[PDB]
Amino acid sequence: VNSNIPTNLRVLRSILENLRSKIQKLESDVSAQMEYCRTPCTVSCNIPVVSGKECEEIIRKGGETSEMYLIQPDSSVKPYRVYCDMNTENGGWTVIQNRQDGSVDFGRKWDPYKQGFGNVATNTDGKNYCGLPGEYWLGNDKISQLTRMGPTELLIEMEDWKGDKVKAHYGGFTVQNEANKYQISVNKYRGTAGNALMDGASQLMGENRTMTIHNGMFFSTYDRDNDGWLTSDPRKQCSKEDGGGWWYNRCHAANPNGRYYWGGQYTWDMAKHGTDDGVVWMNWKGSWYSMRKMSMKIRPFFP
């Protein structure tokens, strides 16, 4: 007659009971982590005898193993630690960015991205040297200064959670200084992933595609808007919505410094702002898939 079955609508109570418990679980987990954070993690990266301007020089000087080396690109600057890849494509690569386990927060401000952040390398099973790379981002000043010594090539590798992997190789790669907002310039692509940096997302068409081209863009953090998204709404920016710092246009086609979504497949109702903010490379697996491994390496070109 009137109220048929309003009581059988307790398929709403069964819900809140779970939520009430969920909060408990969560609040507990945090406080637990809070505690684990009394004491810090440590490493002991003993420095290899050999050094050079960069990794290529190093491997030329006999550095055959992939590990943390001390490089000094210019006598003006102070020697710094960096992870070298001496196995991939003839070796001699200087790791610029590395994502692999979500152990480092890439959602950071201007300075951290400028100074560099994360863990360059970590100790192996039972070894006295840091032969394993860590999730990190070599400073923007460092990166810039490097691409300006001479012609430089870029290698970007990614791996899905299924084990498959592809790459994107740009024979030309140059990053300007802070004054020029670290404007990026790439060219001479070749690879198995898509040319996301130069051509923008392949799924989009017209101006919709063009606004996802990273080539020529400026670097922008959540505290420094330099994206190709000319607007006035403060909450509506590329960085604060899509994870970390990156050369965002009217946002992105590639977001390596995104958020490390475990499992890879994620949805809008999971994203903090409802945007594809993961470690994404649209041209390969769309925008709702965060890679398991993503890295950026650089090496001097032909000369």
Binding site: N208, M211, C238
Partner: peptide, 4 residues
């Protein structure tokens, strides 16, 4: 991605 993109923003209309």
């Amino acid at each position: 991605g993109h923003r209309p």
